[PDB]
Amino acid sequence: KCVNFNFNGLTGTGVLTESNKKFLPFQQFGRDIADTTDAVRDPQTLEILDITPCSFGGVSVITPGTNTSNQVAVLYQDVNCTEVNVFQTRAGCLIGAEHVNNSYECDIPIGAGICASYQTSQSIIAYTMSLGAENSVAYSNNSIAIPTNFTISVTTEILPVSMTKTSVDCTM
Amino acid sequence: LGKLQDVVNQNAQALNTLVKQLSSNFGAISSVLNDILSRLDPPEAEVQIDRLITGRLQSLQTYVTQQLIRAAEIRASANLAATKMSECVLGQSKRVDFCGKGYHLMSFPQSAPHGVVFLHVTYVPAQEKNFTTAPAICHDGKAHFPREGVFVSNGTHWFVTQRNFYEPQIITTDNTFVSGNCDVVIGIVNNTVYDPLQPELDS
Amino acid sequence: YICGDSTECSNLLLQYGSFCTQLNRALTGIAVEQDKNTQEVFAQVKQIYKTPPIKDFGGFNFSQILPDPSKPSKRSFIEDLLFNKVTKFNGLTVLPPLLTDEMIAQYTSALLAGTITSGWTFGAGAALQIPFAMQMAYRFNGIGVTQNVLYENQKLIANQFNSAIGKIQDSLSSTASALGKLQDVVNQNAQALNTLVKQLSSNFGAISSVLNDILSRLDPPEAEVQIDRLITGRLQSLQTYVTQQLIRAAEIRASANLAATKMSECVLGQSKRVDFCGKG
Amino acid sequence: YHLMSFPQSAPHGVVFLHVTYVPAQEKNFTTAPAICHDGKAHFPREGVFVSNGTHWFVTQRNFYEPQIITTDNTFVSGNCDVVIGIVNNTVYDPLQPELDS
Ligand SMILES: *[C@@H]1O[C@H](CO)[C@@H](O[C@@H]2O[C@H](CO)[C@@H](O)[C@H](O)[C@H]2NC(C)=O)[C@H](O)[C@H]1NC(C)=O
Ligand SMILES: *[C@@H]1O[C@H](CO)[C@@H](O[C@@H]2O[C@H](CO)[C@@H](O)[C@H](O)[C@H]2NC(C)=O)[C@H](O)[C@H]1NC(C)=O
Ligand SMILES: *[C@@H]1O[C@H](CO)[C@@H](O[C@@H]2O[C@H](CO)[C@@H](O)[C@H](O)[C@H]2NC(C)=O)[C@H](O)[C@H]1NC(C)=O
Ligand SMILES: *[C@@H]1O[C@H](CO)[C@@H](O[C@@H]2O[C@H](CO)[C@@H](O)[C@H](O)[C@H]2NC(C)=O)[C@H](O)[C@H]1NC(C)=O
Ligand SMILES: *[C@@H]1O[C@H](CO)[C@@H](O[C@@H]2O[C@H](CO)[C@@H](O)[C@H](O)[C@H]2NC(C)=O)[C@H](O)[C@H]1NC(C)=O
Ligand SMILES: *[C@@H]1O[C@H](CO)[C@@H](O)[C@H](O)[C@H]1NC(C)=O
Ligand SMILES: *[C@@H]1O[C@H](CO)[C@@H](O)[C@H](O)[C@H]1NC(C)=O
Ligand SMILES: *[C@@H]1O[C@H](CO)[C@@H](O)[C@H](O)[C@H]1NC(C)=O
Ligand SMILES: *[C@@H]1O[C@H](CO)[C@@H](O)[C@H](O)[C@H]1NC(C)=O
Ligand SMILES: *[C@@H]1O[C@H](CO)[C@@H](O)[C@H](O)[C@H]1NC(C)=O
Ligand SMILES: *[C@@H]1O[C@H](CO)[C@@H](O)[C@H](O)[C@H]1NC(C)=O
Numbered sequence: 001k002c003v004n005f006n007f008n009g010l011t012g013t014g015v016l017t018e019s020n021k022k023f024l025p026f027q028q029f030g031r032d033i034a035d036t037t038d039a040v041r042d043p044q045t046l047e048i049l050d051i052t053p054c055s056f057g058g059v060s061v062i063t064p065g066t067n068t069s070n071q072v073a074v075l076y077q078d079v080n081c082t083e084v085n086v087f088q089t090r091a092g093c094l095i096g097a098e099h100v101n102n103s104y105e106c107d108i109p110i111g112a113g114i115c116a117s118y119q120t121s122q123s124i125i126a127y128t129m130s131l132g133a134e135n136s137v138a139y140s141n142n143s144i145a146i147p148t149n150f151t152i153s154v155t156t157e158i159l160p161v162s163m164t165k166t167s168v169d170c171t172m
Numbered sequence: 173l174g175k176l177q178d179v180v181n182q183n184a185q186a187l188n189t190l191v192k193q194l195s196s197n198f199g200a201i202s203s204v205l206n207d208i209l210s211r212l213d214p215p216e217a218e219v220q221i222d223r224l225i226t227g228r229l230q231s232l233q234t235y236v237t238q239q240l241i242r243a244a245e246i247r248a249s250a251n252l253a254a255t256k257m258s259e260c261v262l263g264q265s266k267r268v269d270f271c272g273k274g275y276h277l278m279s280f281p282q283s284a285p286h287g288v289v290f291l292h293v294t295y296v297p298a299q300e301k302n303f304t305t306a307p308a309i310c311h312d313g314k315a316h317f318p319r320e321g322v323f324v325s326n327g328t329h330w331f332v333t334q335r336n337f338y339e340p341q342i343i344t345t346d347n348t349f350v351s352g353n354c355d356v357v358i359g360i361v362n363n364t365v366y367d368p369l370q371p372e373l374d375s
Numbered sequence: 376y377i378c379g380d381s382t383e384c385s386n387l388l389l390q391y392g393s394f395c396t397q398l399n400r401a402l403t404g405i406a407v408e409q410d411k412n413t414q415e416v417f418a419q420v421k422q423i424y425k426t427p428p429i430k431d432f433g434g435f436n437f438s439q440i441l442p443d444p445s446k447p448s449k450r451s452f453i454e455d456l457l458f459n460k461v462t463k464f465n466g467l468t469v470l471p472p473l474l475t476d477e478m479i480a481q482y483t484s485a486l487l488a489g490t491i492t493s494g495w496t497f498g499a500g501a502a503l504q505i506p507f508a509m510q511m512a513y514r515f516n517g518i519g520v521t522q523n524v525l526y527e528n529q530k531l532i533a534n535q536f537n538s539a540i541g542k543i544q545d546s547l548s549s550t551a552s553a554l555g556k557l558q559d560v561v562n563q564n565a566q567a568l569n570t571l572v573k574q575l576s577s578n579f580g581a582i583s584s585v586l587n588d589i590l591s592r593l594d595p596p597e598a599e600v601q602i603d604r605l606i607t608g609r610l611q612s613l614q615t616y617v618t619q620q621l622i623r624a625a626e627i628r629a630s631a632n633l634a635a636t637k638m639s640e641c642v643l644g645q646s647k648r649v650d651f652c653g654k655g
Numbered sequence: 656y657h658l659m660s661f662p663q664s665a666p667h668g669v670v671f672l673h674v675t676y677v678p679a680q681e682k683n684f685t686t687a688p689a690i691c692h693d694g695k696a697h698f699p700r701e702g703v704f705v706s707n708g709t710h711w712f713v714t715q716r717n718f719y720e721p722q723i724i725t726t727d728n729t730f731v732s733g734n735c736d737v738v739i740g741i742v743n744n745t746v747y748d749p750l751q752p753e754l755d756s
C-alpha cells in the first residue's frame with residue numbers, strides 16, 4: 001500500500017513489499033542505478049523489503065473543441081483503473097469516454113491504437129482506430145483494372161521557407 | 173494554413189516565452205533589474221544581478237538553441253521547397269508523391285507569409301474497367317509485346333492500350349515488338365496481330 | 376525528475392520560470408513527431424489493401440515477407456526476424472506509439488499487398504490490380520531493359536528473387552550487426568536515458584544527490600542553497616538531454632523523410648535516381 | 656539540362672563540375688497542337704510542329720532540327736473537330752512512292 005516511510009532517517013514514499021532480494025548479513029540497504037534506495041532491511045525484523053513508486057502518470061485531457069462542447073474524457077497514462085464511465089487501454093486508464101466496438105478513422109489520437117471522437121445525446125467515444133477501409137485488391141494472374149478517365153487534382157501544399165527574422169541584442 | 177500558421181505561432185510563442193522569462197526572478201530578490209539597482213549597492217547587487225544574468229543568459233542560450241534547431245527545420249523545408257520550385261514549377265517531377273498525390277503535371281507557387289504554397293496540379297486516374305490481360309501475345313510462333321502500354325481485352329477482342337488511360341488501339345506491328353517464340357513465356361495468349369503494310373501492297 | 380515529491384523543491388523550480396513547461400513542450404513535439412514520422416512513412420496508403428487467398432505471382436515467393444495467419448501479431452516471417460534481432464521510475468516515462476506494432480505490420484502489409492498486386496498505381500489512383508509477371512515487365516521497361524528480358528527469363532528471375540530473399544533470412548538470422556542502425560538508435564536513446572538517470576547520482580556540489588537527504592538533514596534557509604545546485608545541475612542535465620534529443624529527433628526526422636521518400640519513390644513507385652534504392 | 660559531372664576534391668569538401676546543356680539561340684515559329692491531314696489529327700511522337708512561315712516541320716523540342724512531316728514522325732488520333740488550334744497541312748507517306756515504284 002502506498003505510504004510515507006522513515007527507516008533510520010532514510011525518508012521516502014512508496015509501496016513497500018516483501019522481496020526475493022537475498023541481502024548478505026552485513027548489508028542494510030540496496031540502491032537503484034539512480035542512487036535512490038531500491039530495497040531495505042527492516043531495522044526491527046531483518047526481512048528485505050522492496051521500495052517501489054506510488055503509481056503515477058500524465059493526465060491527458062481529451063476534448064472536442066469548446067466551439068462544440070464542454071464534455072471531456074481523461075486518459076490517465078499507463079495506470080491500471082484499480083488505482084485511480086471507465087475503460088482500460090494499453091496507453092492507460094481512460095475515464096469519461098465510452099468504448100465503442102466500431103472502428104472509425106482517428107479523430108483525437110490517444111495511443112496504442114486508441115482514438116476518440118465526439119458522436120451520438122452525444123458522448124466522447126473511444127475506439128480502436130481504422131487504418132482506412134480494408135480492401136481486397138482483386139488480383140488474378142490475368143486481371144487488370146485500367147482507368148478510363150481522370151480527374152485533374154489541384155492538391156495544395158504549404159511549406160515554411162523563411163521564418164520571421166528575429167534578432168536580440170543580448171546586451172540589451 | 174496549419175504549417176505556416178504553426179511556424180508563426182511557434183516563433184511568437186518562443187519570443188513570448190523569452191519575454192516572460194525577463195519577469196522570472198531566477199532566485200534573485202526581484203526580476204525588475206532597475207529595482208535591484210535602485211535597492212542595492214554593488215557589494216550586494218552584483219550577486220542578485222549575477223543570478224539574473226545567469227538565468228537570462230541561460231534562457232537566451234535556450235531560445236537561440238531552439239531557434240538554431242528550428243532554423244535547421246525551416247532550412248530543410250526551404251531546400252525542400254526550392255527543390256519543388258526547381259523540379260515542379262521550373263520542370264515536371266517524375267518522382268512519385270513528391271509534388272502532390274497522383275502523377276505530377278505542374279505547380280504554381282503562390283507566396284504566403286513566411287512560406288510558399290504550391291498548387292500541385294496532378295493527373296489522378298478515377299474510373300476503372302476490369303479486363304482480361306496477358307504478358308505478351310503469340311502471333312505465328314513469335315511472341316509480340318506492347319512497345320508502350322499494356323495488352324487487354326473486353327472479352328471477345330484484344331487491344332493494346334496506354335498504362336494510365338484506357339484507349340483501345342487495334343494490335344499491329346506498329347505498337348508491338350517481337351521477341352523469340354511463345355514457349356518460354358508463362359501465360360502467353362494467342363491472338364492475331366495486324367500487318368499494317370501488306371493490305372496496302374495488296375491494294 | 377528535478378524535484379520528485381518535494382513541494383520545497385517544486386516551489387524553487389517555479390523561480391527558474393517557464394523552463395519545465397517548454398521542456399515538456401519540446402519532448403511533446405518530439406513525441407508527437409514520432410507518430411507523424413510513422414504516419415508519413417507508413418500511412419502513405421489510404422485503404423488497407425489485402426492479398427488474395429491464391430498467391431500465384433508467376434513464380435515469385437513473397438511468403439517470407441507477407442504476413443502469415445499463424446502469427447499472434449500478423450508480422451511477416453522477415454518482420455519476425457527483424458523483431459527478434461533488435462533488443463524509468465523518476466518522472467521519466469515512455470509513451471506508446473500511436474500505431475501498435477500490429478497496426479504497423481497491417482500497414483506494411485497494405486503497402487506490400489498494393490506493391491505486389493497493383494504496381495505503382497495505388498500511389499496515384501485507386502489500387503489497380505495487375506498480374507505480378509506483367510508488373511515486373513514494366514519495371515524492366517522502367518530501367519531501359521526491353522521487357523522480353525523478363526518473360527524469356529521468368530523462372531530464372533523468380534529463382535534469383537526467391538533465393539535472394541532466402542539469403543536475407545540467413546544474413547538476418549546469423550548477423551546481429553546487420554540491424555546496427557536501429558540497434559544504435561535504440562542504444563543511443565537507452566544510453567542517453569541511463570545517462571539522464573545517472574546524473575541523479577551526481578552531487579553538482581550539493582551535500583547529497585538524493586533530494587530527501589537534504590530535506591531530512593536541513594531546514595529551508597540552508598536547504599535552498601543545496602537544492603538550488605541540484606535543481607541547476609539536474610536542469611542543466613535535462614536541457615542537455617532534451618537538446619541531444621531535439622538534434623537526434625531532427626536526424627530521425629531526416630531519416631523518416633528519407634524513408635518516406637523511398638516509400639513513395641520505390642514502394643509506391645520505381646525510382647530512376649541512381650543508387651537511391653539499392654546498388655544497381 | 657544536366658549531362659554529367661566530374662568530382663574534384665577540396666579541403667573539407669567536394670567540387671562538382673556539372674557539365675550541362677544550355678540552349679542559347681532562339682528562333683520564333685508558328686506552331687500548332689496537332690496537324691489535320693485526311694480527317695485525322697496527326698500529332699508529333701517526340702518534338703513539336705513548327706513552321707518558319709510557309710512550310711511545316713516537326714522538330715525535337717530542345718534543338719531546332721526541321722524534319723519533313725511523315726506518318727513515321729507522327730501518331731494519329733480521332734479526327735479534327737475536337738482539337739482547339741489544329742492547323743491543316745499534308746503529311747507524307749514514306750511507303751507511297753515505293754509502292755508506286
Ligand atoms: C469488344 O470490343 C469490340 C471493338 O470495340 C467490339 O466489337 C465491335 O462490336 C460492334 C457491335 O457491338 C460491331 O459493329 C463492330 O464491327 C465490332 N468490331 C469488331 C472489330 O469486331 C465488341 O462488341 C466488344 N465485345 C464485348 C464482349 O464487349
Ligand atoms: C495457340 O494456338 C496454337 C495453334 O495456332 C496452339 O497450338 C496447337 O496446340 C495443340 C495442343 O497442344 C496441338 O495439338 C497442335 O499441334 C498445336 N498446333 C500448332 C500449329 O502448334 C497453341 O496450343 C495455342 N496456345 C495458347 C497458349 O493458346
Ligand atoms: C514459398 O517459399 C516457402 C519458404 O520460403 C516454401 O515453404 C516451404 O515449403 C516446403 C514444402 O515445399 C516445406 O517443407 C517447408 O517447411 C516450408 N518452409 C517454411 C519455412 O514454411 C513454399 O513451399 C514456397 N511456395 C511456393 C509456391 O513457391
Ligand atoms: C521554309 O523552309 C523551306 C525548306 O528549307 C524553304 O523552302 C525551300 O526554299 C528554297 C529557296 O529559298 C528552295 O531552293 C527549296 O526548293 C525550298 N524547298 C521546298 C521543300 O520547297 C522555305 O523557303 C522557307 N521559308 C521561309 C519563309 O523561311
Ligand atoms: C482544312 O482543309 C479542309 C478542306 O480540305 C477545310 O474544310 C472545308 O472548309 C470550308 C470552310 O469551313 C467548308 O465550306 C468546306 O465544306 C470544308 N470541306 C470539308 C471537306 O470539310 C477546313 O476548313 C480546313 N481547316 C482550317 C482550319 O481551315
Ligand atoms: C525488537 O524488540 C523485541 C522485544 O520487544 C525483541 O525480541 C527483538 O529482538 C527486537 N528487534 C531486534 C532487531 O533486536
Ligand atoms: C464555431 O462556432 C460558430 C458559432 O459560434 C460556428 O459558426 C462555426 O461553424 C463553429 N466552427 C466549428 C469548427 O465548429
Ligand atoms: C490491474 O490491477 C490489479 C490490482 O489492482 C491486478 O490484479 C490486475 O491483474 C491488473 N490488470 C492488468 C491488466 O494490469
Ligand atoms: C462489443 O461487442 C460485443 C460482441 O462481440 C458486445 O457483446 C458488447 O456489448 C460490445 N460492447 C460495446 C461497448 O459496444
Ligand atoms: C472487377 O471484377 C471483380 C470480379 O470478381 C470484382 O470483384 C471487382 O470489384 C471489379 N473491380 C472493379 C473496379 O469494377
Ligand atoms: C491462373 O491461375 C489458374 C489457377 O488459379 C491457372 O489454372 C491458370 O493456368 C493461370 N493462368 C495464367 C495465365 O497464369
Ligand SMILES: *[C@@H]1O[C@H](CO)[C@@H](O)[C@H](O)[C@H]1NC(C)=O
Pocket residue numbers: 681682683
Ligand atoms: C518573336 O517575335 C516577336 C514579334 O513581336 C518579338 O516580340 C520577340 O522579341 C521575338 N523573339 C525572338 C527571340 O526573336
Ligand SMILES: *[C@@H]1O[C@H](CO)[C@@H](O)[C@H](O)[C@H]1NC(C)=O
Pocket residue numbers: 739740741
Ligand atoms: C489565337 O487567339 C486569337 C485571339 O487571341 C484567336 O482569334 C485565334 O483564332 C486563335 N488561333 C488559334 C489557331 O487558336
